[PDB]
């Protein structure tokens, strides 16, 4: 169980770019996932990010997404500052390879100090656009 808490997961990116876009894949399974926010940043040090980079995603235009079981969603289009072999971190809040688990909504949180580290939880990929 996870919800209504925020995971900031952080992932390796080898393909740079000025317009990217987020895939999203229900890998834990069984019960549907709601994305209350999901916000995309650039990684400092540890789980700690950098909200002037960081750009909130929306999805059909709507910011709020649920994803049923075996279902796969991207995110729309947005400008990001990408680069060959950089660090990248998306945290998404819930409700009702290194990831940080936070209790309640965490979306505007750089430090994310007192994070657990788990063992993944949620697809995520950067992908191309139109």
Known sequence: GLAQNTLRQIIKV???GKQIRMRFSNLFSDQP?????VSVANVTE???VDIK????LSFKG???????????MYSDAFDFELQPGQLLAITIHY???????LQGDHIN???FAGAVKT???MGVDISSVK
Request: net charge negative; proline share 5%; charged share 20%.
């Open 109 to 111: 949180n750089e430090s």
């Open 14 to 16: 080898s393909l740079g």
């Open 53 to 56: 980079t960081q750009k909130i």
């Open 46 to 48: 540890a789980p700690a």
């Open 119 to 121: 063992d993944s939880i």
């Open 62 to 72: 709507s910011p709020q997404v649920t994803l049923g079981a075996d279902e796969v």
């Open 95 to 101: 409700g009702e390879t290194t990831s940080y688990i």
């Open 33 to 37: 996932a709601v994305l209350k926010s």
